[PDB]
Design a protein around this ligand. Structure first.
Ligand SMILES: *Cc1c(COP(=O)(O)O)cnc(C)c1O
Ligand SMILES: *Cc1c(COP(=O)(O)O)cnc(C)c1O
Lengths: 365, 365
């Protein structure tokens, strides 16, 4: 007896385990070290005992409605998934298969390749250029990766781990290419409210007929363990997506969907997103400023709570052991030939924790 | 542009919608019309604000530990999924694939065939015999369905929709067959605490080396929308299963896992399961007794909150329109040639709702 070979798809947890043993500050964890806002907790608390049974696979009506309002679409174009993780899994399962190719940009988020593989498709990687000015997408490189077998392109903006936010010029180009080649566009926008400059434009604004936008309540409201996410896309494809997620987990947690629906409305009216953005901006500048003071190259992020910097001559292991600071090496985001001495820092930690990390790194340089 | 054909896998919701329009008593819904116990609500309420971020894919340590204690196994043999629905989906994805066959018993629960198809396997159906004494499993029929390509057998006990509870004699036979043919055994035991006779024996007691047992907190604690379930199986296969569910939804809702862990311990010490069993037993007898008084054949269930009965000359549609009572036809649980005039009744409703249903059915006979 043996498991099917597709289970071959089954460093992040390992780095955290090593950090706990050595008592190192963990800047590798990709989630907040604080609780969610009080208005969310109260909304959930209020739903408990009133909405505890199965919600429709497509999602609680109140949540679909609340999301439709924000995206300026009809409720039927919204499907609630068990986290953006499920949204991405179901999207690949529904869009590609054996004989199909999907374009993924490198550095990538960890679920992209596994999801493509589990769907039976082939992932073609297009690497962003690391220029003196920072990360940049080369449109000619993207264009040359397209083949008659390509059916979809997966984009992540604001981007994890680079912190890159694609501008209107690049979004328009991607839209034209998708139209010319009749491709589906999957946009992982879980960090859509975490940006530091001008309000970014969305890919769906340029190619609404073929773009699926993914979001996460966990990444918007500092509640990653709630497992409530969504897909916003063309109405004609949504019923089938709802049908597919029905088999994977049936429906997202009902009381959590209920609380999130209410929290999304209040967050907007109470200016919670602006306060969140400023709180992270302060921490971004604290960390970036501290690293540059040490003479290190830091690629200041336009979004997300991640930042990448170069630490010449270091490897993640020696760092956590000597400096007592855990970081994630660039190798975790590249398939092969990762940039040298590049590391991802997560600044969704307390300022005290960040100051501690800088002091420790400073000692060992 | 078009979705991949596997999306072809994407009457239950339709019957509920028809019932709402006509103001009919809905005995077709497979979930409680009441809230969960207070001790569960309080435990969740207590977890909110303390455990809101990502839990490990395998599950919160406290939940894995609480489950291991009940099943008399080590924590490593437990994996927490986002509902039993996800457990079943991931099990099929991990055990079978193209060129493999899975045996499923008919009448079946709705996710079995779709999960087998989405995994690329072929489902071979073995139909239970409907004898004068009720539903019965013919071992010779099961044995004749095995081929060299068979890799697993899917069992559901207590069984939805029949209410059948497999006895020791049948479990032992299945165990011998699984061993002789080196098959994996998947046992859907979400209703393991809802039985009306002697405490049933578990399949894993007879074939612990090749059996995966599935459970659901939602079906145990009257909280179906919480999406917390589990797989208990041989330690050597669990790491890979945890790896597979990581890609589908990452991890189950953290505060819900926390509350469930506590609730499972209290339920046992406070005799909640016995009280639950008696409460359902009263409703089972109320419904069964009322139907037999009308001269109808009722197959009294040994478990679950479902019961099947025969209503000669009726179809589900005419019933909901004339009697104003919604039921699910046997056709929803069979692939072809479903038994004539057989319907599934769900008695997880208030006694007042059940009395109303009986009065309405009585009028139209
Ligand atoms: C966190 C994250 C996800 C997953 O979101 P969930 O709602 O927690 O499943 C997907 N994509 C990116 C880029 C993320 O950072
Ligand atoms: C309800 C049910 C399930 C699904 O359980 P969840 O925890 O709600 O996903 C699986 N199998 C059977 C027989 C069920 O009745």
């Amino acid at each position: 007896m043996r498991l099917h070979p597709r289970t071959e798809a089954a460093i992040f947890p390992r780095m955290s385990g090593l950090a706990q043993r050595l008592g190192a500050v963990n800047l590798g964890q990709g989630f907040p070290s604080n609780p969610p806002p009080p208005f969310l907790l109260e909304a959930v608390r209020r739903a408990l005992g009133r909405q505890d049974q199965y919600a429709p696979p497509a999602g609680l009506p109140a949540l679909r409605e609340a999301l439709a309002e924000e995206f300026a679409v009809e409720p039927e174009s919204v499907v609630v998934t068990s986290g953006a993780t499920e949204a991405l899994y179901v999207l690949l399962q529904s869009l590609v298969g054996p004989g199909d190719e999907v374009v993924v940009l490198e550095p990538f988020f960890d679920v992209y390749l596994p999801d493509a593989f589990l769907a039976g498709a082939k992932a073609r990687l297009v690497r962003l250029d690391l220029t003196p000015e920072g990360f940049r997408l080369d449109l000619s490189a993207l264009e040359k990766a397209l083949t008659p077998r390509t059916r979809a392109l997966l984009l992540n903006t604001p981007m994890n781990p680079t912190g890159l936010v694609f501008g209107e010029r690049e979004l328009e180009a991607i839209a034209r290419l998708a139209r010319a080649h009749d491709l589906f566009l999957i946009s992982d926008e879980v960090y859509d409210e975490l940006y530091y400059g001008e309000r970014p434009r969305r890919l769906r604004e340029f190619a609404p007929e073929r773009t699926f936008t993914v979001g996460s309540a966990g990444k918007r409201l500092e509640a990653t363990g709630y497992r409530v996410g969504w897909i916003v896309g063309p109405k004609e494809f949504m019923p089938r997506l709802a049908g597919m997620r029905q088999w994977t987990s049936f429906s997202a947690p009902t009381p959590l969907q209920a609380g999130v629906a209410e929290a999304l409305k209040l967050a907007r009216r109470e200016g919670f997103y602006e306060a969140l953005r400023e709180g992270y901006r302060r921490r971004r500048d604290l960390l970036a400023g501290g690293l540059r003071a040490m003479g290190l190259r830091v690629y200041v992020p336009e979004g997300t709570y991640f930042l990448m910097a170069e630490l010449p001559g270091w490897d993640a292991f020696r760092l956590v052991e000597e400096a007592r600071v855990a970081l994630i090496p660039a190798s975790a985001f590249y398939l092969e030939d990762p940039p040298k001495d590049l590391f991802r820092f997560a600044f969704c930690k307390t300022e005290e924790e960040l100051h501690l990390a800088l002091e420790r790194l400073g000692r060992v340089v």
